[model samples]
Target chain A: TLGARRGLEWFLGFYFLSHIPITLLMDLQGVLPRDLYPVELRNLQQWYIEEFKDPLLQTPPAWFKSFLFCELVFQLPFFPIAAYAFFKGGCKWIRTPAIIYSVHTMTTLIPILSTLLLDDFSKASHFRGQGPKTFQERLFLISVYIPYFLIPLILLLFMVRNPYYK
Target chain B: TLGARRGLEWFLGFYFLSHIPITLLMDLQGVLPRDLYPVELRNLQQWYIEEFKDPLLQTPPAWFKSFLFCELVFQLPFFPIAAYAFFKGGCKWIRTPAIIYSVHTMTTLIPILSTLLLDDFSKASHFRGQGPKTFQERLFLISVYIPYFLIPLILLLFMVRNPYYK
Candidate 1:
């Protein structure tokens, strides 16, 4: 009965709705604070930071910038297409994007997280314990960021377990 | 009106079939000639070289070795799964692998090809034009490697033009 339809529809909606706006802001973070942007745009990113409880908006590191740049480049636009595929019920091709998106999430996150974790908490001290701390940090990352890992893995499994998604 | 099912099925067959064996031999080339292998296996490799008109088997370059190493690592195994997805008709998941394979082919070939072309066929200098040469050079490359670029590009377009395969 196409188990994918419902789950993907919800996820796609969430994926696009949550990611597209913020990624757009991050991709154009500089412009958001510039003369080219409307005042509302300026306020939106500031709002985005506080509403998400993210203070890293002040000046994100290079890796974070690069990750966001990829999201903007690859992940954001795929959201709409994903949404359409899920809702419209004709996409027999969703598996590929699903796999790629998951891997993309993994690739973007793994390096940063691994670099942070393996460095003896070097990154934690980067900004006055600004990121996650030891006990809470691991818990926090697993709780949230690990989805980027799991979803891709799951997508991989879904395809591998049944190539045709039968 | 599914434009995807037929073409992908054929290509995936060729992709998996053509790569898996050659890559397997290359991955095991060194030990394969010695022990822990059947005599028939050794003969098959010799058989393959003569059949394919390949002269590189005797002594490949560092870059050639590097490329074959990559093919062994990444490009070999996906063939069966790709074949399965295409043949059984349930692989709505071919998009991701398709892109990756094309990119892999491009990555592996582009450097070698570019180096050969730019250096005025210094590769041709290597062992007396062991590879393609003369005015037919471009034709030879296009005949073989251009498909790598085209396949991935088409796969991307298939997904992007309509993720649903409409």
Candidate 2:
């Protein structure tokens, strides 16, 4: 039980920490100008937005948005219900909700994190302009992107267990 | 147990179905045209890829790449282990993982579906070059971007329960 609670706490901690910069950066400056990045990093952000963002923005059917909205709207209540179910029904109910939440959270966070980093980089590029480059510049860019790429796969593989639906 | 399995299956099925179109379209088209997209959408994709892909290429620092690779590599074994834990660790574990997985899968899949719908509308716009004049076209563009705006909150909320680390 402690292990589960601790895991939940850790998840929360990481989740919160990750978003602070995202919120701050995006609020301060809007997203733009991905190509002006270092040659090695130039297309990375651009490509992701193209592949991931464009498609999502283009299609989002009413039912899906409604589903997301409902989930979001009910999330506060849902957790307590889930916790109660766990307390009452034990781990059987717990497994489904945990897996659902873990996968959901990581997948969404990965993209958002990706967006934030790219936006920051774009802004930096805008301010810095095409100037003299250094190994560190490229390294910094890589550092930002690496976590975005790996976290989802890791969550899917390690954290999410296969669920059985009735 | 049945419920857990079915939920995972449903989520995976939806994910594959939703992504297949986007992947196909991307592969067919190669890189997307920057001029066709909005600035926000472009910034988002750039962020997604930078976070997702850069590390895999190993252009970053060795330590960073190693960290990312380790996270991803470990998950290969960890997911199944977690699943087994869920199924065998009595009802409590089962319930948590299942719920988390279901919600995770649904949220992830919904966004992709939204993107696909938008792509269709954008293509129509390109053909007309007159922009989205019809209700359907407006609806399509709105549908695509709506998810971009909404999914982040869902992700942050669900992330509270995520147990990825340790």
Candidate 3:
């Protein structure tokens, strides 16, 4: 009556199992001989860390980091409790999970992909050594990287709300 | 059976209909007297233009915009063809409409919501003029606003390849 639960369960199980090999392939690509490949994975990693991460640390106030850390800590417990609610057959849990997961997944993907795409364009233009071209690019780089810096801040925010943290 | 098409049709009708009122509200809020509200909608508009439209114009080059303009120019003739595909059923055109509509709804909401939430925090701190004394208040502003900036950028990246616009 509620659709094919066994088939749906099997599909999900297989889907998750498939990600192991896919992730392995991605990892392998990273370590593959750089001389043989046109693109160097190490350069990409350095670009990400240096061009992206370092600026985030320097820009935002130190308090923001504490805030993100709190949010992350809260999210750890929130997800499981929410999942349990869904498993207990409460429909209300469905919308919250859907919205939260959508926001989470979307937030994680956008900035990274935008940077990657923009970086690719920058590199192709022989401007990788020159740095970001315009104020827009600079602002974008800051905006995109702000989230990673703020993740730890979010956790810190949650911590302050807890009396135990005081 | 296709189940009840009425429910699906009603949903589609309501979804599009709701956009009319929502868009009007947006315009109203956008153009409302700023002195009375204490929040400037122009700031949000400037952010949108600065963050999205300007960067897109530079990054994609001009030809892509021309292509997009041409698509809109041809939309009148294209609609009948799309309608034929929809009536025939199982055509990809039928599916494309829903996907396009979903993306349209998302892009519209994320920016506006982010702006509203961030501005609320900014105003709450009274422009942060007093300075944050407690960890909780500082954390509250960061957690709310950072995610707002992060989430939309991520979702938009997934649609980079979308044919609707450059």
Candidate 4:
């Protein structure tokens, strides 16, 4: 259970901290070709593009560019709002922003998930012949999306009830 | 202010009822040529498609297609969850679902709003350029989206503090 006082602090801190990478490193890094991510931070698609280096590899589906574009636009508004809310300890002030941010995460992820599932479950899985072709790729399958799923869902749990509710 | 115990009922009903058209009507109807959307429901480019009937007008901007496709995929998960939560009347059961749904609405609307703003705010507003063109169209623009905005924020107010909290 979260502490009664400053529950917002923990939730906001986690929410704010977690997004640093996603917004700056993950989404921002996307501007470069998928092949260019530094080894430690590179996404799965990045690795695929680098290794396969084949035109037929099929650059991520068209929807992905759309996703990147939307992500870039959506994240910008909240950046200023988040900085204001976080540094000033303005938890109450951020309530509305938090509300929108929560919803934004859901809308963005669902389609990405749908597309991934289609590519994975289809006759030819996107990873390789049938499944993840390499050890890192197998790990990447779960690893890449886990944070997106876990953070938002957990934050919502923090969001749904204030700490004193019980 | 809503009665805390049954507050979910009012909100769940409104939110559930509101999405019918977005899903079943505008998005589903998109299968037909983009031009035909009951005028008011017709989007910016949709009007142009109908009026000009240009071959190029047939192609919606890449972003709009991205928006539509994402909207379609995004709606799939929550339809059943909403139906279950709404009908079962499980306030606690739906607490999390409500959080996600609220966020989903925000995510869905922002991009739509961005698109509409670009088309409407620029030259010639989309609705007949005559302001919603028909009575129904006039009603559709304001009436349809208003509820989508209001219910979620109000519901989040309900969500943030459970009744027992002081």
Candidate 5:
């Protein structure tokens, strides 16, 4: 159990640390000024959008942008705190924040995954160029987003079962 | 502290109990068969929508329906459990589930509230009928939704501050 717990912490710690760049470079791109990001960073995001055919980044819906805003406001600040807590291990203080983060992040994925699977991109009036028009493309995009959903789920489960982290 | 705690439990318990009918009769109406709801229940939802000019129920967005599906899957079952836990008092088992519930529910409100305040209803392709048009109308609709957001937020804070519920 001790070994299992430590391994999970390592994964969770890495997860939190890694999410920072993804948020700053990719997710926040909708609302942030273009010039704020380096040309390479912007290129990477654009490349990812085209590669994944992610309509979300191509032409972010108002609701999607609003969710990103919530991400910016709520989840970004906690990343470092959570990363540190998990890396250090055995931090009882992390329990509540971890619960909040895991659950909130998981909730955001529902609309995203649902849109990927269900929404008709062809009919979307505001949909910009090169979104997932094919089923294969949709599956690919879902694949990209799935990790974000699953990791937080693992963290939530970890927090749920292990109420008092050892 | 004991008195304060019990009062909150009563409030939270009542909140959970009240939500069942709202979810079944109103929120779920979009996807559920029309025949599932009685005429009076249907009339009550319609009256609330017309009276408040709520765009959400006027024509439920695909993403919104996805969210309701989540509410059905993840939250509906937990409601009874949480209501019982709160009513019983000192059920430590409720802690983790409460955290999950509060954070997930609160996260969902981000997009809902933003739509009420920000989305251009006139431009919506699938917008069926009467919806919030004026700023006052939007604010009124927001007033109805705000309690859901605020109560969960309070629950999260309550859990956060009192980690080891007595």
Candidate 6:
């Protein structure tokens, strides 16, 4: 029996499922017109901004918007499909795509994480509710983002560690 | 015998071989200090800007520099290794890494290509030697970048199309 691995599959399956709303309602707001979002969704984003002090949510720079665009076009479509594959638990077909997704997501996170850690937010021409300027704020924001990087990394390792999955 | 495939291997090996100097001398200059570059390399970059009318080379935005940093940290090390793998031909070990590199490179290109095709370069507060304002110039610039996107794509397909190479 494929015992302990099933737990990871279930976790990853739920991860992909939960990511759907996060991508569609929250992350994509950077690129989508504010008028198109309903009041509740807009309020939800506002809450996130107020809660996190995320400058990216307020006015995502062009490059950041471009990453959101890739998310909408490339990664968003893969979420449901990947979730289904993970839930199925033994599908080898998901290997290559999963690997690709993991690496790409991790690559995007490099800059996002770097900006949180290295960029001088005070010097940047950020709009309302600018990003964290304090060390505590940066740590809080980094903690929020670290999961996205870590999960994909785990996925990559899982797919690579076994060439043939049961 | 592994016949016609050898031709592709040679081309790809050369492609990676050529990319090393390009990344070190030209692209990395975006993030690295100018004082470190010798006069010839600096002159070479200037010549490229004058010839191509690329604003990115003059004053790369922070996000763009982040991508360059990824190039320096992630992709730079892989270039020579990949070239050797291709040159050797039929090294199955290269498959997964090649796929990872392909997808990551392609993901970065999505935004870069989008910027060339969609962004309003003229309105941007570009420094000296502004990016192209004319349609023909955009066409030329896109043509210059398309190969970076295409070759990685071909590498991805080549790696995926066969599970057991050679």
- Candidate 3 per-residue lDDT, tens place, A73-149, comes to 43334544544433443234233223343334333334333433344334443223444556565665667545443
Most DockQ-accurate candidate:
5
Please state the error at residue B8 of candidate 6 in Å. 2.2
DockQ of 1: 0.04
Question: Cα RMSD (Å) per model?
Answer: 11.8, 15.1, 17.7, 11.0, 2.4, 2.8
Q: What's the true lDDT of residue A144 in model 6?
A: 89
User: Which candidate order results from sorting by lDDT in descending order?
Assistant: 6, 5, 1, 4, 2, 3
DockQ of 5: 0.69
**Per-candidate TM-score against the hidden true structure:** 0.44, 0.33, 0.27, 0.44, 0.92, 0.89
- Candidate 2: list runs displaced more than 4 Å: A1-71, A83-90, A120-166, B1-22, B25-131, B139-166
Compared with the true structure, what per-residue lDDT tens digits does model 3 show for residues B48-152?
A: 434332222222222223323322343223444544543443343334234332333343334333323332223233223222334554444345335423433
In model 5, the runs with Cα more than 4 Å from the true position are A128-130, A163-166, B123-130, B163-166
Those runs of model 3 whose alpha carbons end farther than 4 Å from true positions after fitting are A1-166, B1-3, B25-93, B107-166
TM-scores (chain A) of the candidates: 0.64, 0.33, 0.31, 0.58, 0.93, 0.93
Clashing pairs in 1: A164-B90
Candidate 6 chain A lDDT trough over 10 residues, lowest sum: A120-129
In candidate 6, the residue pairs with backbone N, CA or C atoms under 3 Å apart (3 or more residues apart, or in different chains) clash, namely: none
Question: For each candidate, how many residue pairs have backbone atoms clashing (under 3 Å)?
Answer: 1, 68, 22, 1, 0, 0
Cα lDDT of model 2 by residue, A75-132, tens digit: 4334555545434433444443444444654545444433323322222432232211
**Which is the winner by lDDT between candidate 2 and candidate 3?**
2
lDDT of candidate 5 at residue B159, scale 0 to 100: 75
Q: Candidate 4 clash total?
A: 1
The digit string of per-residue lDDT tens for model 1 on B1-166 reads 6565566656657756665765565445742344665788777766654444343454554335545555656666677776676566545566556655654454344444443343332343433444444546545544555565566565555544444432
Alpha-carbon shift of residue B23 in model 3 (angstroms)? 0.4
True contacts kept of 3: 0.00
Query: Looking at candidate 4, what is the lDDT of residue B117?
Result: 28
